[PDB]
């Protein structure tokens, strides 16, 4: 990494690597080298990570696949419909659908001013016409488990999964939790 | 129907043929057979019906399946929440998913008062444990379509319907209107 220094830092709400590795001039890609984190979306809340700091030669790509800007204007199968919880953007809700963000305004008339959401707002999802998921049902938490990794293993998405559990905080996972998930997300004919 | 008059009535928001014919002493069935109605689960904001009145012999049973009160405990398969809309409360959500009340309060222990809730929150639905539904996707409504209806046809629940469509309104659905259909909603294994 070529870093200047190492400090022993404190895993937070709200962090990801990416977050930690901007904050600190790191490297995504270090952090899981030099801790030797199995899985670099996995970091929990509490646990201590030697960071690389200021690092004239961070590695953010060889270990992780960073996925491009959202193309698609909708989602395949479901949901209709999506809760905003605290914290929530249109942004961040797009992006967790792979959707742009237009389309997700352009979904979504009737609300006056898109930076004023509130908790507890319903809002429509734009669903592709002629698909489905394949087959939606119980799963249980394993050690490790998020969603953006069950998304990518089951087809589907993080905004999905959130849908469909939508009061389920997903850093707050506890093994043997009992999940909904949509599988096999796509457009169909 | 052994009726005493006949009433020309204008169907409003909220009616069925069980509203009506408890407010006008008639029975579903003579309602049904008067107006030739095709679906007695059927009638349409703003027609006009003839209602026999105060009947000394009623027919409620024999065009009709009268389900009974909900047993169940869980809904198989999803959601894993719903969020409350204008007019709902946990007995009427428990019944759309035909699970008992009980089983429904149970799920929310954060909720301090049953009869208490706000639209916009987001309660729990207790899911089956290995349960799923077999094919959730779009799906664009004809003519005289009804969750009520879909939920029988297709093996689910209004209430599974209208979580996956939750800013829907079920009595304003429009023939070529898209909704998010679960299908086959089982225990396995
Ligand atoms: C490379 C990069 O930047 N990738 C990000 C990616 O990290 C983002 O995904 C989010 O990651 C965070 C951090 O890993 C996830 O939060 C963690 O969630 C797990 C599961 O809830 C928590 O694990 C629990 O931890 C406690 C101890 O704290 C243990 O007792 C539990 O057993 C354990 N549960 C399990 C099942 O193992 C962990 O503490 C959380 N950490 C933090 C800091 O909150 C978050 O869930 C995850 N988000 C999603 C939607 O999956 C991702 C976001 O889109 O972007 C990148 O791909
Ligand atoms: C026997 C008995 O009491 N059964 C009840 C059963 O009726 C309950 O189901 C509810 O029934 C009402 C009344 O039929 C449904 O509301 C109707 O919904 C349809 C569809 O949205 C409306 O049709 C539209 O009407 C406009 C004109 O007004 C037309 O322009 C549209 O084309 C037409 N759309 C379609 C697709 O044909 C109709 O106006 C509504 N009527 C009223 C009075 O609101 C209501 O959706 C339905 N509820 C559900 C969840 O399905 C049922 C409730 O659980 O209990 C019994 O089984
Ligand atoms: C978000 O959507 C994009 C666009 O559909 C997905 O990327 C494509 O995935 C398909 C299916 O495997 C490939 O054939 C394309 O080559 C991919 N790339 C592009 C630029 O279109 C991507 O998989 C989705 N991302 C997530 C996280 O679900
Ligand atoms: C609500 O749940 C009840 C109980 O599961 C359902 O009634 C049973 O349906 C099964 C499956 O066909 C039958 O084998 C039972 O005999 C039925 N009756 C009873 C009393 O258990 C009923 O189908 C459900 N109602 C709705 C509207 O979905
Ligand atoms: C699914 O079909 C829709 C509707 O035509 C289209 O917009 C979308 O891009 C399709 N999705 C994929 C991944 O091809
Ligand atoms: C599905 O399984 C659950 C969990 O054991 C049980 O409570 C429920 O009654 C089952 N449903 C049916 C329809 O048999």
Request: proline letters at 6%.
């Amino acid at each position: 990494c070529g870093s200047t220094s190492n400090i022993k830092y404190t895993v937070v709400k709200g962090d990801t690597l990416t977050s930690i590795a901007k904050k600190f001039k790191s490297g995504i890609c270090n952090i899981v080298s030099v801790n030797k984190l199995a899985n670099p979306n996995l970091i929990e809340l509490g646990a201590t990570l030697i960071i690389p700091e200021n690092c004239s030669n961070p590695d953010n790509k060889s270990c992780v696949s960073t996925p491009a800007e959202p193309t698609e204007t909708c989602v395949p199968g479901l949901p209709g419909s999506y809760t905003i919880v605290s914290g929530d953007t249109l942004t961040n809700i797009s992006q967790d659908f792979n959707i742009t963000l237009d389309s997700l305004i352009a979904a979504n008339t009737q609300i006056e001013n898109p930076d004023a959401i509130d908790v507890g707002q319903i809002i429509t999802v734009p669903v592709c016409p002629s698909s489905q998921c394949e087959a939606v049902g119980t799963y249980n938490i394993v050690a490790g488990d998020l969603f953006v990794d069950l998304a990518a293993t089951y087809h589907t998405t993080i905004g999905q999964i959130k849908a469909l559990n939508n009061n389920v905080n997903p850093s707050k996972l506890k093994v043997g939790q009992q999940i909904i998930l949509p599988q096999d997300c796509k457009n169909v004919t």
